[PDB]
Amino acid sequence: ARATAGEVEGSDALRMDADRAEQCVDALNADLANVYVLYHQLKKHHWNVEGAEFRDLHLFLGEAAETAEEVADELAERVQALGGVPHASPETLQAEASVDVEDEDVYDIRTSLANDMAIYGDIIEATREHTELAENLGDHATAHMLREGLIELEDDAHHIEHYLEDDTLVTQGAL
Amino acid sequence: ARATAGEVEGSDALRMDADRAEQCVDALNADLANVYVLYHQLKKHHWNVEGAEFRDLHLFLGEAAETAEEVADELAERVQALGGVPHASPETLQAEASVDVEDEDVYDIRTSLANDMAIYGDIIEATREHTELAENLGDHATAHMLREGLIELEDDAHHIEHYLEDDTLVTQGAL
Amino acid sequence: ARATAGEVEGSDALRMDADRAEQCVDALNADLANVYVLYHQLKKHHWNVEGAEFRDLHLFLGEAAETAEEVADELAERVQALGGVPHASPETLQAEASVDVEDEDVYDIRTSLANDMAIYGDIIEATREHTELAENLGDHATAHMLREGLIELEDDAHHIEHYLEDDTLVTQGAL
Amino acid sequence: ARATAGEVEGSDALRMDADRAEQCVDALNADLANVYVLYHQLKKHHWNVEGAEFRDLHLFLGEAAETAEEVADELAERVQALGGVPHASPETLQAEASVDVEDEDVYDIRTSLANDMAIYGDIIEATREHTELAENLGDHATAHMLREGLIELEDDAHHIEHYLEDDTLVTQGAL
Amino acid sequence: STQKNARATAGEVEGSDALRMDADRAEQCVDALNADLANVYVLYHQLKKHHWNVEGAEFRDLHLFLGEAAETAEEVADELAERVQALGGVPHASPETLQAEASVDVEDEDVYDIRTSLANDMAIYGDIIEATREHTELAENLGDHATAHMLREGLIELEDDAHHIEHYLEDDTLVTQGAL
Amino acid sequence: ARATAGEVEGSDALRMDADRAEQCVDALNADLANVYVLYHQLKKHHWNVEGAEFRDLHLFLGEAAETAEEVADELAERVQALGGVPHASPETLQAEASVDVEDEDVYDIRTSLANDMAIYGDIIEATREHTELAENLGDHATAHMLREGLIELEDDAHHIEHYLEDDTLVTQGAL
Amino acid sequence: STQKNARATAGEVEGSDALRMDADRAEQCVDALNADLANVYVLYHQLKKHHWNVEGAEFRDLHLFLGEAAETAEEVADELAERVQALGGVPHASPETLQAEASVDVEDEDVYDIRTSLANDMAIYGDIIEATREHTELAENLGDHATAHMLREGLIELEDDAHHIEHYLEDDTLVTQGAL
Amino acid sequence: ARATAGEVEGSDALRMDADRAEQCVDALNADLANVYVLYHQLKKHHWNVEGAEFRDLHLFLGEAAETAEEVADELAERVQALGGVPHASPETLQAEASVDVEDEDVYDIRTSLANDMAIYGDIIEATREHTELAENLGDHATAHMLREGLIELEDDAHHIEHYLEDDTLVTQGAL
Amino acid sequence: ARATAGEVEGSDALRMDADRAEQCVDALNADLANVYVLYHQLKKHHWNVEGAEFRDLHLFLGEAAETAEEVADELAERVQALGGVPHASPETLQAEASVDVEDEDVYDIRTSLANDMAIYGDIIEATREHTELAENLGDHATAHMLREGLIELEDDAHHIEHYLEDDTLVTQGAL
Amino acid sequence: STQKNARATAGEVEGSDALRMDADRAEQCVDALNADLANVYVLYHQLKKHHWNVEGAEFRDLHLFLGEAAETAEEVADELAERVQALGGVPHASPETLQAEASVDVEDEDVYDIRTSLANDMAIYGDIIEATREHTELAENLGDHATAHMLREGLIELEDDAHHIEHYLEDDTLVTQGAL
Amino acid sequence: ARATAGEVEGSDALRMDADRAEQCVDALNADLANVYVLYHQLKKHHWNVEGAEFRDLHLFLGEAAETAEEVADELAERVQALGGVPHASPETLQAEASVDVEDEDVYDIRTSLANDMAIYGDIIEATREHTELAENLGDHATAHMLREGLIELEDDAHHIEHYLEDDTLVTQGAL
Numbered sequence A, B, C, D, F, H, I, K: 001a002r003a004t005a006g007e008v009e010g011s012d013a014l015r016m017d018a019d020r021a022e023q024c025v026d027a028l029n030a031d032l033a034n035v036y037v038l039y040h041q042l043k044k045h046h047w048n049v050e051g052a053e054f055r056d057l058h059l060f061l062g063e064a065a066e067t068a069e070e071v072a073d074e075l076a077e078r079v080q081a082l083g084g085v086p087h088a089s090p091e092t093l094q095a096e097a098s099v100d101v102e103d104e105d106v107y108d109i110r111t112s113l114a115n116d117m118a119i120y121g122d123i124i125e126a127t128r129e130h131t132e133l134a135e136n137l138g139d140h141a142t143a144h145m146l147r148e149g150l151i152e153l154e155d156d157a158h159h160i161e162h163y164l165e166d167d168t169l170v171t172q173g174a175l
Numbered sequence E, G, J: 001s002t003q004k005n006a007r008a009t010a011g012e013v014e015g016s017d018a019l020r021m022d023a024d025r026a027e028q029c030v031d032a033l034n035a036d037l038a039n040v041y042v043l044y045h046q047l048k049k050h051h052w053n054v055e056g057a058e059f060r061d062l063h064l065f066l067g068e069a070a071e072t073a074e075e076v077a078d079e080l081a082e083r084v085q086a087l088g089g090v091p092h093a094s095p096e097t098l099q100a101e102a103s104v105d106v107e108d109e110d111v112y113d114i115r116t117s118l119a120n121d122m123a124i125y126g127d128i129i130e131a132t133r134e135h136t137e138l139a140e141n142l143g144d145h146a147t148a149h150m151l152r153e154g155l156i157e158l159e160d161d162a163h164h165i166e167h168y169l170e171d172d173t174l175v176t177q178g179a180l
């Protein structure tokens, strides 16, 4: 093999020694796994959402999945740039994720969104810790990328929170 | 000062004597104040809307706010073109507005929309009267601008009316 | 749960009874799993590719991954439309996939591309058989969707074949 | 009411307790009020600017106003996301603003721009302090959002500085 | 009549049966629109002159503005001429004809400073703006709501450019004696 | 039913009582029926046009049909906004139309275009009268919408007139 | 075999292992696609000729149409040639080869009137359309659904252009003896 | 006056002495006058064209007029750049033009186009002479500009020649 | 026949007598034949290119073919404009071409590109001679067109030269 | 002071009152940014050299990459220079000055093979990347969060291009001895 | 080394012998050095411009710098294409430039622009000489490229001349 899973070489081009690079990679690889499980669960909810609000939700969840995909790509490319091996196979990504993943049954949209919000929250807390890590290691490019991703993730988590809030235009009358 | 609040000079370039220009300015400045309070309340509702329909509403209210902003800009530039001084500070705009403005608490989305619909209705009635005024003064450019704005305002007010209507895809079952 | 994994309800809107739909869904879900494994492995190779041709390959592989992701989305949405439950979690996708997936080490580019070429071939052969199945059930929309995906998959597979062919501009002199 | 002005609930989605969120919200709402006063005063100057440079200034000021409006929208949405109530009505915005606002007369362009420059400086100094507050609370998304706005605000402030500098192409000969 | 070489004779107005506008009504509108057309094309040509020739400390901003103003005038002229033709008239066409039929004042061929140039343009705009207002009322009074609408759409663009010129001429500036 | 055909409720949002709205709706619904007949006949002529000029005419007629469809949409939406019920089914549209409609045979292009020209004229004359009705009721938005449509209708009608005029580049020599 | 100068010999077909298409199946498809390619490139070149040379009262509309039709034919040729290559064959390439392998009738180098020119094109389209229909059935019968799909996507574009030519030739016109 | 019609100052920026510049200016001004007469007559023909081919011609003539306008602008700007005064007023442009201009009657389209073809030919011949003049003076930018314009004018003239050619799809049968 | 292959009539619109036009036409037709052979061979190489660099080459060769097609179109249109008949059928174009064309076997990419380079060089030399011819006849539009085409052909020929140069990133190590 | 010909003297730093940045703080930031600017403009010019001169089997892909990399460097230089000026300093300007003030190693004027060329570029990137990291900490420590933000936005683009070069130099390839 | 600074090999692809190519290369390299000094000084003036007209100038100078950069790129690529070595390092470009470069102090804008005007004039004169050189060598692509660049440089030089002219809208009154 050209590279072995779990090894971190650092980078001469980026002037990152293997020691610092390994600490960053460890964090970024853990995030990658969670963000890809998030991407797949968002896809699931995008595909399956039904009912009175479904089309708006389908569009939102599709866009949220594309965001998660792009964050994943950034995390993975950074892992590779730092001389690591990004988690790749679906079985690896899920095994390495710490978040909870739905079983293969389809739940109602409130349950589904609440499950996703939990995932977001875990990723958000982790990402805040990892940005601090990167900045303390002097890896400002990593810290900056993590913040650029964090803002997009927090926006989506916030949207979910709002979808679940106890207000509606619907009245008893209209029923 | 270069110009004093409340004074109207007219315009030699536009061949509008100060007498006619003052009548138009008086109407346009009153509209400007109401339309900017409308813009700020729409922004408020855009920011705060929550629940099952929130994202569609957030997008609608954002777009409705941008429309109000553009109408305000047009009214203000016309005031200035006619040799007047458009109402400018936030405190002035609200003091000069005749419409009701919500206090700083956040109301549920039905209440919030109903409050906005009332504002629209007042602006719509006023704008119809002001277009007639402008045309009777021979200020056809003003009358035309007012109509171009009126159609956009009536479209948004109509959308609000529809959001509040007593129909829904939701059934008791789905609850 | 709202739907149980493996169940196929058909669709009243699409006038497809569950019996007929089930045959199509079993094919499309098998394809979905293989295509998402392909997507993840193309992403791996996109992230990790190095050497004299790497940027052209990085771009190709990224585009190929996007094509796979879009085909997956189409298959999953068709499953759902026919009253099925698309495979969703990463562990399910890999478990339900028939194709071979690389272990987590990184291999040289010729090895990597050859591995991908084998996955394409598997999917292309299956898709051919599934288009016939769909047309024999009278599900012309599914058969049409399969063909539109098949052509894009064959194009990428054919590109891989060309990348591995025994020609080059490079000479011993230039070495 | 659904939310009472001044209250800060935090956010479960964003994993920010109310205590922590409240510190951030008090800063962001203070900034919001100053930025919306800035927006309205830039609009004033956009509408009223006259003379030899007026079209270039009209365009600059209009773009600057759009930047302010976007920064305001970001601040307000962040307040709401953290479980706060963004200042909304014009009278509230001006009352909660710390910066100085022109009276309703129109001043010459150098005076007007100098007044705006002072508002920018106030906001820029506050935003610097608020980014540090956010980062010290571990609210990296807020701190990142503050910096993205800060750079655009500094750019406009710097433009104003250049407009007021003691150089020109004009000569006594050309007069 | 069947042997005339011309397809239409300048100054005649036939109305339109497609548009259900009789020739009597159409003739009143065409008289107005053709007069406007001549003035707008003189404006266009003078804006072009000023666009080409403007120099000095603000010249690039003015060059861009004047070019955009000329394009606007060209577009309004096109609309007026096409409306004359739609109503069964003959739009004034040759440059000599357009200037002969124009009521506005044209600069001679020497080049003047920018303040003079813009003030001369401002006077043209004003004359056109007053006439357009009159012609909009004429069209609405005859029930030709499409012409009235078209005139208003043009008027707002011409007023905006007239207003910009008024602003360029105003007595304010960033320049100070100390910068000089 | 939610609304009964022929009923006009007015609108609270738009501050139009039913009495006033009804006058406008009766005009707009009559126009709607004629414009949709026009749309269908332009489509017919678009589909069937043949000969030396057919492609230019096919494109013109298709664009003209799109214009008619947009005018119809505007009229129908205004009817609904004023609390009316827009004519909807094809049989209703043709029954409520005052203009003449071709039988199902295909006629030569001059005949076809002349038939369309007559429909345009009818609609143009009515629209002129309806804009006056709207303005006399103080419904300036409706009157403005009517004028914006009228100009596009007159443009297409005028094109037809030119297509039928007695000139051509063709000579006996070229024959 | 290891010492041949050519990388591939014209007329041989190797199939594809990437595409899981054996050479026997691939050869039947390639025979069909190459024949189509030759006819489509002759069509392309004749459409170009007519685009360049068209004159008279309708010439600009026809010039645009014929240019668009040629671009369509060029695109279909590209797809057919790339499919031949994907299936392990050698697409016909040189102009002499393309015309030699084409079954359709080509105009000689003189320029004919537009009605003649379009009628000659119409005959080419028709021949290609009938063959493409046959080849789509051939591909689907061999299980080469991607080739069949590609052929259908091409066929609809070629049919649309053939139909336009049929319309241009139809016996109607706005022109009247009185306009003449 | 800043500059007198007929003065040619040359340019220090462009390193063109007044003697060389004057030769170019006289040529360019001659061309400007002709090109603007061409513009006005193309407009005339665009406005008035009627009959079986009118829409295609209306479009072509509008585009040809656009091209003539852009050539005139380039000619005039170059005059000014070389320190001369471009011909400006409509009366001056027609007086200074050497080509024949139609009287104010409207002619049939064949006559109209033949008149335009003659103007084009005169301009084309002159432009070829002026390009040679420019190159002989070492004014390669002028020469290049003249050629860039020439190619566009030749293309339009060529189109007119083709419209007038003795071919058509029309048959006596169709008549 | 309307025109006989080999007749050159010149143009009254372009004020080009048949004697001058014929000299240009013969030159342009020669170039047209060569450029279309070049197009067909670039297509061939685009379709067939294989190996480590094939995708970059496939793209380059497709673009080079596009450029050759556009040059041929300009050449042919100019022939026609000058009153000649452009070479049209595939057999005629190859017969009239002076450059060498590959037989129908597929060669390796270095051989293929070297064959193309030779065609380019022949065309480039001819085009330079033809530009001088055109300018000497006073046909400046032809000369300008030829140069606009020449620069694009030279750029493509230059690229081929670079692809064939004796450098690479590949090392014996990588092999 | 009132009689100096220069408007600003190279090496002086005045801070900004608009930006509420005193001269002492601003001077530390400007020293850093100007040093970066010089290195980034040397990088830009060497990327341009390599873009122009690259040849061989991968040259077109590298030509495109190097052109894009140079545009990135140009953009970063622009941002650094404009920030120096905003903080009341004088950005290094002339080519001689930029290279004199640059700490990185510049190739001599001969042309080297692509592997050598890219390795020389890689060394420049690395030096700039290490300094930029230092300067981001400097800016944040002084409370100049906008400069820090700007530096990070630049750093990520420069790191991406440095990483691409690292990949181009890696010891893998599709090429095989059999293809040779 | 692959090529030595100062070697000129010509090109077999472009059919340009080293003797002819060397004459062009020397000319183009001279121009490249001057154009890059011009670029750097335009950048300088873009960065530093202050005062009443600064934003318009900042924009103009940025665009002029862009144009100079693109001309330099074309010059350098042509050098390389002809088998020479383009001047590359900043020190080499300034050493090889014949134009005067400002010292590192910042001058007022009139002085700055006058310095730039002088550089433009020197380049314009040289470029005219080089175009003639190229055409005399039969290198028509070089000649054409030089003219395409010349026209853009002349336009920018002309703008600078206009900015420096003795006119303004400013009056003593406004002061």
Ligand SMILES: [Fe+3]
Residues within 6 Å of the ligand: A073, A077, C046, C062
């Ligand atoms: Fe990626």
Ligand SMILES: [Fe+3]
Residues within 6 Å of the ligand: B073, B077, D046, D062
């Ligand atoms: Fe505005």
Ligand SMILES: [Fe+3]
Residues within 6 Å of the ligand: A046, A062, C073, C077
């Ligand atoms: Fe989807």
Ligand SMILES: [Fe+3]
Residues within 6 Å of the ligand: C148, G153
């Ligand atoms: Fe399709």
Ligand SMILES: [Fe+3]
Residues within 6 Å of the ligand: B046, B062, D073, D077
């Ligand atoms: Fe918002």
Ligand SMILES: [Fe+3]
Residues within 6 Å of the ligand: A148, D148, J153
């Ligand atoms: Fe950012």
Ligand SMILES: [Fe+3]
Residues within 6 Å of the ligand: E078, E082, H046, H062
């Ligand atoms: Fe027009």
Ligand SMILES: [Fe+3]
Residues within 6 Å of the ligand: F073, F077
């Ligand atoms: Fe609609």
Ligand SMILES: [Fe+3]
Residues within 6 Å of the ligand: B148, E153, F148
């Ligand atoms: Fe409008």
Ligand SMILES: [Fe+3]
Residues within 6 Å of the ligand: G078, G082, I046, I062
């Ligand atoms: Fe292709």
Ligand SMILES: [Fe+3]
Residues within 6 Å of the ligand: E051, E067, H073, H077
């Ligand atoms: Fe211009």
Ligand SMILES: [Fe+3]
Residues within 6 Å of the ligand: H148, I148, K148
């Ligand atoms: Fe050009």
Ligand SMILES: [Fe+3]
Residues within 6 Å of the ligand: G051, G067, I073, I077
């Ligand atoms: Fe063409």
Ligand SMILES: [Fe+3]
Residues within 6 Å of the ligand: J078, J082, K046, K062
């Ligand atoms: Fe810049």
Ligand SMILES: [Fe+3]
Residues within 6 Å of the ligand: J051, J067, K073, K077
């Ligand atoms: Fe380049």
Ligand SMILES: [Mg+2]
Residues within 6 Å of the ligand: A080, A081, A083, C050, J167
């Ligand atoms: Mg690596």
